[PDB]
């Protein structure tokens, strides 16, 4: 298959974990706001003052309400 990088969270070929942050970020508005912009979501775990989050490693991590970087 092509290779790809891997999800920090789970080892899971295919993934880029990003740290998300943002105002009165919760879980579920997370989501949503990830699936508004189209982008499948992968694992979502807890990080400092946020959530790590898996994206598709070709992902455009652009989403308004978010800040989205590498981890």
């Known amino acids: 298959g092509g290779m790809a990088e891997r999800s920090l969270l789970t080892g899971e070929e ?5 740290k998300a942050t943002g105002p009165r970020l919760s ?3 997370l989501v ?8 499948e979501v992968g694992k979502v775990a807890e990080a400092e003052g946020g959530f790590y ?4 490693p070709e992902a455009r991590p652009e989403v308004a309400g978010l800040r ?4």
């Open 32 to 39: 949503a706001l990830l699936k508004g912009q189209g982008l």
């Open 14 to 18: 295919g993934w880029r974990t990003y």
């Open 27 to 29: 879980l579920p508005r």
């Open 68 to 71: 989205l970087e590498p981890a």
């Open 53 to 56: 989050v898996d994206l598709r």
